[PDB]
């Protein structure tokens, strides 16, 4: 499945009037000035998919997500987000070409959900989501600061991530099967992202995987190793991205959300990363919030975010139909 659009009403900085945010089946770049409300779109997605952590969505508490009014608009009565999924590939266990999930929260924190019009419970929404293999907070969602995480992540945490992606006696064989694949993807993808360099994944206890962690051995531009903890922001970002993409190449998630994952990339690396996103766009949907000309110029469609007296709004542009 893939996101066709989002509709916000009273959600954070978007004010009261319904805001329709459409997405390319492939690569969409969300752009606009600092403080425009770009990251709030990412929070909107965390919100509809069941997010429970106020902090995770940059809010003091859940009710804080309700638009508080502005110069021209009064405090919203509630915050609502509706997400429309194209279900032609039937990823969802629903025989419908369009699955719609909608969540609304009131000033008292109470949330209400709906699935294709019929109201559901949070648990029901999560079950349907996992069923379509959509993780509201999986590795596929890279918000600001999540890169310093794929790096600080312990070797055990990292292998646990793969356990999950493999699908849990002969279980070692399955694990190894998916590990050998992702490891290869990682080496190929890293070489491409870092010309003249190479990298690979290594199991601490290759004979008994589950007893050890999963480490990363990187040789950036040379043939000399270098602890990832010792790299600079730029190399750390590339490395985390190589890992994320190495996973998607093996098991394409319905969609990936990236929030300024290019903040520390030089222009040539923004370009390589952008090309990798396009090539990957064929199997998964990519929603990328960026401030870089290079990343933006490479997207299929662009969602422009701007403000108006404290109120966010968007304008959608298709680079294809713009030709």
């Amino acid at each position: 499945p893939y996101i066709e659009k989002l509709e916000l009403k009273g959600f954070k900085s978007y004010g009261n009037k319904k805001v329709v945010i459409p997405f390319s089946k492939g690569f969409t770049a969300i752009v606009g000035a600092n403080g425009s409300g770009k990251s709030n779109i990412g929070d909107a997605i965390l919100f509809v998919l069941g997010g429970l952590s106020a902090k995770a969505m940059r809010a003091s508490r859940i009710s804080d997500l309700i638009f508080a009014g502005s110069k021209n608009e009064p405090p919203a009565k509630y915050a609502e987000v509706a997400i429309y999924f194209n279900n032609e590939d039937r990823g969802f266990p629903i025989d419908e070409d369009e699955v719609v999930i909608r969540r609304r929260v009131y000033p008292d924190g109470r949330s209400s959900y709906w699935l294709n019009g019929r109201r559901a419970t949070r648990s029901e929404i999560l079950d349907i989501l996992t069923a379509a293999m959509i993780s509201p907070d999986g590795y596929n969602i890279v918000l600001q600061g999540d890169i310093t995480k794929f790096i600080k992540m312990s070797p055990l945490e990292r292998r646990l991530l793969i356990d999950d992606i493999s699908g849990i006696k002969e279980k070692k064989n399955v694990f190894m099967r998916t590990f050998e694949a992702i490891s290869r993807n990682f080496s190929e993808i890293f070489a491409k992202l870092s010309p003249g360099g190479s990298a690979r994944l290594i199991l601490e206890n290759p004979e008994d995987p589950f007893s050890g962690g999963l480490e990363i051995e990187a040789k950036p531009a040379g043939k000399d190793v270098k602890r990832i903890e010792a790299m600079s922001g730029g190399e750390k970002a590339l490395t985390a991205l190589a890992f994320v993409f190495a996973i998607q190449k093996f098991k394409p998630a319905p969609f990936y959300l990236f929030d300024e994952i290019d903040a520390h990339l030089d222009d040539a690396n923004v370009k390589r990363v952008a090309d990798l996103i396009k090539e990957s766009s064929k199997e998964s949907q990519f929603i990328v919030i960026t401030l870089r000309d290079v990343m933006m110029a490479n997207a299929d469609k662009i969602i422009g975010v701007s403000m108006r007296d404290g109120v966010s709004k968007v304008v959608s542009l298709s680079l294809e139909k713009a030709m």
């Binding site: 110029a297 304008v315 542009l317 680079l319 713009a322």
Partner: protein, 70 residues
């Protein structure tokens, strides 16, 4: 710089509007026909809207983009 490209684009919007009195089509605002140039023009308009210099109008998703100076 970028501080200039935005001010020039704004003047271009003002001049056209000062004569037509009707919202400017985004298309007649983009010089060269290349993803890089189209997006940069788009971006600058977004910046001008934040600045309360212009107002961007769009009726439907991916529909025609029109601009009106403030």
């Amino acid at each position: 710089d970028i501080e200039k490209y935005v001010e020039e684009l704004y003047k271009v919007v003002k001049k056209i509007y000062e004569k037509t009195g009707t919202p400017i089509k985004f298309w007649d605002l983009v010089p060269d026909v290349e993803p890089k140039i189209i997006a940069r023009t788009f971006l600058y308009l977004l910046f001008l809207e934040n600045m309360g210099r212009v107002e961007i109008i769009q009726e439907e998703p991916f529909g025609e983009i029109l601009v009106v100076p403030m």
